[PDB]
Structure 1
């Protein structure tokens, strides 16, 4: 990986664009103002370690960038001198200071989350060179936020229909491995999901967490055996019962998920699971239930009909809240067409039909990890302060067309209000000490990570109020 080639093309030309005698460039990141009123800050530590720390400049990487940019621009605009200065004076370590709110923190929209500035007047251009790298923080931030908002919905309806939050952490399972754009995205996004839940089929997220964050337990996420359409349909259309019987027998003492919509979902629940193989189901342990998985049709209508079918073939109880409950050896997972919008429609529809959320878990793939954009939380990186000719000026952009696009001014700090909320102070006014100490911590300075967090601390920082 070459950091010289890891930025937007036009930033190669920006060192020629600042006012002469600019010694400091200071920029910040924010999620500008389900409304997504607060965001989980997560992901920066991965980027600091993988891409920014240590000796990131070498003579080979300088020559490599020079050659590519010569052709890419059909001209020689690359700042070979500036990158050679960093190589010689700092042994390839970036003269940059980054301050950030602790990872896992839940911060309302419109607050400074991290800031970036150069620690050497010669590398004024370096602050915004690494904008492209740092701005991709939007994705772990957005995945963790949107997953936590789904946890809020599940927590509300689980508590309503069951009376507690038992198993809340396993109610949203990550199916997004094949639905995302790359391997690296799969690991990043799955790790952001594991901030809030414990269930994932995306194995790459586990290795990311151990390498860059760490956890007391051996792994941060868990899975169960499960069938796919290929392992069912390979038996032939007339032998779906044989496949079902073989699979739950092979996994008789662990939980097993079995997709049951290969040909007819309703038929499989009523006659195969509910009549032919019913004796293999009711014999199952509470620890290892059969989890029927519908994979097609309208998500809410399918779940309700599936439950109504199973309720008439199996012994239903009424829990202490008055809500119906399958026997402990039988559960349901809906892992098709689940995003935050449809998830809300399902649990509300289940509650209206007096079904407890204990009966169901959810799986999400593309919605959980792929259908998200930087626009969703307005993740933005803008320069707020420069020093030219020895006097610093507060800088901002205020487009006439859009008020929302307006940016913060000057040196920034994050503080607690007297009522315990968050406030971002502008124009260096945090130096007046009317709001206490600045919340941001130096996490990166001059090529070294100076403060880090375990994935256990991040999980505790990210918990819901209902859980506290």
Structure 2
């Protein structure tokens, strides 16, 4: 079972002895510190952490003893604050005397703004604020995943709108195929849930269950998939029977969309001769609700997509839409799921546009051929205010060799500007009442989640301006 006393950076075990004597308050905050890309971030994922790890009785006699014994061996010394943890156990029935304020989940906020704050609600637990830094800082991951997929969606939306005149199906243009490529089962759930803030197509089932348990959606599930082949279901037929494989698969899945990986041996032969000739009769008979989705999975992503489209464009009836772009028939689509990061996504849709192919023809997969870190958005947790001997003091770091690492001073609040933008006020200045109400909400207090958001409101908060029309 998870033990919060063992879920911190080792050195933090020793910090209660390092703060100034008679420190009653330690107040800290999280931001995506400022540095033309990633100018605004989606705040998402804290609610998962609050619920899974921080809420309720998180301290017990057994957990304290377990922690004591581990740290004794780990430090080769007795440095563990048994008394402090016993105090939380005895006084608060193991509930953390901590208050956390945060911007609403799904909110899109410019870099360099306070996103959440953490402070102890009991003077005895001054050390607790930064003990939980490590666990809270991991919010960097869902924030960054949600932000990066939103930035990909912006690109897709721009080009889909330009080439088609609408945004129909945008939420299905970037399918998450990343399950095998993440570092653990837990990460798969978190990352997928972050993808699903932006999109609805996913092969990472773990995301659904996390969203259901921690957020909730009006719909039965937040994300969907369709039958698709992998290389093993094609190659198992034998090198000379790729056509037989294709035929079997599209016949098994004749009334639903089906994606068929087409590059096991020769993607271009597969498109021109197998799909485009030998099996063409099975493709042109398919319903608009059940297209064949051809999947290349190798070679230069851009060149391969453009060549596949040209091949298909000559074997199938192509129309020109109202915007002047070429459109495959509705029973035939392409998905490119190899090497698609934000850069190559941009490259492919621009390349298609230059060749007069509608973005309607294509979808993308995120997974193979790819990497986001805590430093991408400079996600950082810092102490900004302490009370020692009853005197509050504004604290910060400001390293001489890196002004970018300067942290904020004093008690923080988030506000609307007269123009309707966000501004973070420092040094308790929000109390001057010149900038209206603090936009942060208390979301955790003394062992209880005090405010939460459904996955539906998170998605609405995370919407693109272009979607808002």
TM-score by length of 2: 0.99
**Whole-Å separation in 1 of the counterparts to 2:422 and 2:298:** 44
Say whether the 8 Å CA contact 2:337–2:368 is kept in structure 1.
no
Say whether the 8 Å CA contact 2:338–2:368 is kept in structure 1.
no
Say whether the 8 Å CA contact 2:29–2:382 is kept in structure 1.
yes
Counterpart residue number, 2:211: 209
TM-score by length of 1: 0.99
**Whole-Å separation in 1 of the counterparts to 2:287 and 2:234:** 23
Say whether the 8 Å CA contact 1:162–1:356 is kept in structure 2.
yes
**Whole-Å separation in 2 of the counterparts to 1:193 and 1:274:** 34
Aligned residues: 465
Shift of 1:325: 0.1
**Whole-Å separation in 2 of the counterparts to 1:204 and 1:466:** 30
Counterpart residue number, 2:185: 183
Shift of 1:374: 0.4
Counterpart residue number, 1:95: 97
**Whole-Å separation in 2 of the counterparts to 1:401 and 1:173:** 42
**Whole-Å separation in 1 of the counterparts to 2:367 and 2:109:** 26
Counterpart residue number, 2:462: 462
**Whole-Å separation in 1 of the counterparts to 2:109 and 2:415:** 11
Counterpart residue number, 1:30: 31
**Whole-Å separation in 1 of the counterparts to 2:60 and 2:208:** 31
Counterpart residue number, 1:411: 411
Runs of 4 or more, structure 1, over 4 Å off, are none
Unaligned runs of 5+ in 1: none
**Whole-Å separation in 1 of the counterparts to 2:417 and 2:467:** 24
**Whole-Å separation in 1 of the counterparts to 2:212 and 2:423:** 33
With over 3 angstroms needed to count, the CA separation of the structure-2 counterparts of 1:8 and 1:366, relative to structure 1, is farther
Instruction: Name the SS of the counterpart of 2:181 in structure 1.
Output: coil
Shift of 1:366: 5.6
**Whole-Å separation in 2 of the counterparts to 1:402 and 1:94:** 35
Q: Show CA shifts across 1:294-339 (max 9, x none).
A: 0000000000000000000000000000000000000000000000
Shift of 1:446: 0.2
Q: Show CA shifts across 1:13-69 (max 9, x none).
A: 000000000000000000001610000000000000000000000000000000000
Unaligned runs of 5+ in 2: none
With over 3 angstroms needed to count, the CA separation of the structure-2 counterparts of 1:381 and 1:366, relative to structure 1, is farther
Say whether the 8 Å CA contact 1:180–1:366 is kept in structure 2.
no
**Whole-Å separation in 2 of the counterparts to 1:304 and 1:389:** 69
**Whole-Å separation in 1 of the counterparts to 2:252 and 2:68:** 59
**Whole-Å separation in 2 of the counterparts to 1:366 and 1:300:** 15
Shift of 1:399: 0.3
Say whether the 8 Å CA contact 1:206–1:220 is kept in structure 2.
yes
**Whole-Å separation in 2 of the counterparts to 1:381 and 1:55:** 24
Shift of 1:365: 1.1
Q: Show CA shifts across 1:337-394 (max 9, x none).
A: 0000000000000000000000000001168xxx110010000000000000001000
Say whether the 8 Å CA contact 1:37–1:108 is kept in structure 2.
yes
**Whole-Å separation in 2 of the counterparts to 1:268 and 1:300:** 18
Say whether the 8 Å CA contact 2:98–2:447 is kept in structure 1.
yes
Say whether the 8 Å CA contact 2:203–2:225 is kept in structure 1.
yes
Instruction: Name the SS of the counterpart of 2:30 in structure 1.
Output: strand
Of 337, 340, 345, the match for 1:338: 340
